[PDB]
Write a protein that binds this ligand. Structure first.
Ligand code: V8L
Lengths: 300, 237
């Protein structure tokens, strides 16, 4: 089990650790988070009391180094940092654990929610889109834009999600115009699966990554991307049976976890009613369609 | 974006544009079968593409043989229309390619846009007008060439005959749409009007009679009476 120590909490903030979150009062004696399950990626994120504008966050994997949090009053935020001095870190953590100034990552043992939300999310892969390579962790916020969003204005602070575009030469073989637009199997399987990700785990990873940035930060381009990657599968007549079944599970946990009051903005009616009732895979998403209909029947 | 009465005169500026109407590409007659069921029979159709400034009509004839062994013909017709318009642009020299293509039905935007991915500089737009171009098969010469055709075929026409020699594109197009609106609302009468006087002829190289200016005004008037009429006979007013 691993630990993210905080130097201090100088301002009132709501703090998130994966799907958990708790309130820290301005200059409450707080020194961070313990018992973090090893073996998964994790995300720690922030919403100041004083400006609910700007949710922001750090993706990190404890196996890749020792990481702490420290408020920066110049720039005004909780910054993630790496401690390279190993014995200095262990000693700091022990002293704060002893004084019991840390909240325990509260995992119930029946609960596989996090793994189910993060199965194919990888830290070297996230770094292929949130380019900031001097650091082993990756910063995201609400207002970062995607590479494709800038094609329609700062590239270093962008989310280079894989570019999907259904009316594109990449997506449309010449002379199969109608075949390829109505049935995107060739885009999905050859261009994307074989050509880009290499495999479905990778494709599912980016899609999982897409959704969490959308849910955690309200990143609008992230949610366009999750929906796009969903749409490309739903709109393909020929999908490996293992892909479809894994997708049904993935979407099932995504839906289950979504806050019940955030759905209006984070769910696209068109994509889902297509996936679930018009597309080729209307029959194939049994778990996701049951949970959609019992929880958000309004959207349909 | 969309084309409506506000931006109506754009059509007659010097940017090259084509209207594309797909209403008559897929045409059937519906009959009973010996077992008492219904079946369709496709007849020849055509794609109606028109440069509203020059009058040039590119009339692509769609031979029933296109449909043989095809399914979902209504949806296929729209893709086949987009393929023919894309082929038409690709055939034209660059200075002759349109800068816009205005489709008369929104269902054609996606099928055309996908076919013109190679032309990112041609704008594909819809329209809010209720243009009468389906009535184009009520023009005898056009219906003839379509029904007699035995293979795919492109035939070129000026739908304005020689009108542009004496009037402007804006008025020629207004004339053409009045005549097509009348043919659409009551074909029999509209035709009766155009041909009542045997002394007025249709030159072999034209579609419409050789009216003088004063005869055209009398003609145009009667076509407006007709459209008002049929509106009453249809709405009791
Ligand atoms: C773009 C790329 O490297 N892989 N897709 C991905 C997979 C997991 C997380 C984030 C992205």
């Amino acid at each position: 089990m691993n630990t993210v120590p905080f130097t201090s909490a100088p301002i009132e903030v709501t703090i998130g650790i994966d799907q958990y979150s708790f309130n820290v009062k301005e200059n409450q004696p707080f020194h961070g988070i313990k018992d973090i399950p090893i073996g998964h990626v994790h995300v720690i994120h922030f919403q100041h009391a004083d400006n609910s504008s700007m949710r922001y966050g750090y993706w990190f994997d404890c196996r890749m180094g020792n990481f702490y949090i420290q408020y920066d009053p110049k720039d005004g935020l909780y910054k993630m940092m790496e401690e390279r001095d190993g014995a200095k870190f262990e000693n700091i953590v022990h002293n704060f654990k002893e004084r019991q100034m840390m909240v325990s990552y509260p995992k119930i043992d029946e609960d596989d929610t996090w793994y189910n939300l993060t199965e194919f999310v990888q830290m070297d892969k996230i770094r292929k889109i949130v380019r900031k390579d001097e650091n082993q962790f990756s910063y995201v916020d609400s207002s970062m834009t995607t590479v494709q969003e800038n094609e329609l204005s700062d590239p270093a602070h962008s989310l280079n999600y894989t570019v999907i575009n259904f009316k594109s030469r990449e997506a449309i073989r010449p002379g199969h115009e109608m075949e390829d637009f109505l049935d995107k199997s060739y885009y999905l399987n050859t261009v994307m699966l074989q050509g880009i990700f290499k495999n479905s785990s990778n494709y599912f990873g980016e899609l999982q990554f897409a959704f969490l940035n959308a849910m955690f930060f309200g990143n609008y381009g992230s949610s366009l991307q999750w929906h796009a990657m969903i749409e490309l599968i739903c709109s393909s007549a020929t999908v490996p049976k293992h892909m479809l079944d894994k997708l049904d599970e993935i979407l099932y946990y995504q839906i289950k976890t979504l806050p019940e009051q955030y759905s209006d903005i984070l769910l696209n009616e068109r994509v889902w009613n297509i996936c679930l009732y018009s597309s080729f895979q209307k029959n194939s998403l049994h778990n996701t369609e049951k949970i959609m209909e019992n929880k958000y029947p309004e959207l349909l | 974006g969309a084309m409506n009465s506000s931006n109506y005169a754009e059509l007659f500026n010097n940017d090259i544009k084509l209207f594309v109407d797909d209403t008559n590409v897929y045409r059937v007659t519906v009959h009973k079968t010996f077992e008492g069921n219904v079946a369709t029979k496709a007849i020849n159709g055509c794609i109606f593409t028109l440069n509203p400034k020059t009058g040039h009509l590119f009339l692509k004839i769609i031979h029933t043989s296109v449909w043989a062994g095809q399914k979902r013909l209504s949806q296929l017709a729209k893709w086949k229309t987009a393929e023919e318009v894309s082929a038409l642009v690709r055939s034209l020299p660059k200075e002759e390619q349109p800068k816009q293509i205005i489709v008369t039905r929104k269902a054609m935007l996606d099928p055309l846009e996908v076919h013109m991915l190679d032309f990112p500089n041609i704008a594909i737009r819809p329209t809010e007008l209720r243009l009468p171009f389906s009535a184009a098969m009520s023009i005898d010469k056009l219906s003839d060439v379509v029904m007699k055709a035995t293979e795919p075929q492109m035939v070129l026409f000026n739908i304005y005959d020689d009108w542009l020699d004496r009037i402007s594109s804006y008025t020629a197009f207004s004339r053409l749409t009045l005549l097509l609106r009348a043919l659409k609302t009551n074909e029999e009468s509209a035709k009766m009007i155009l041909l009542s006087d045997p002394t007025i002829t249709i030159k072999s190289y034209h579609l419409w009679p050789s009216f003088t200016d004063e005869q055209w005004i009398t003609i145009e008037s009667q076509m407006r009476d007709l459209i008002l009429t049929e509106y009453g006979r249809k709405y009791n007013v």
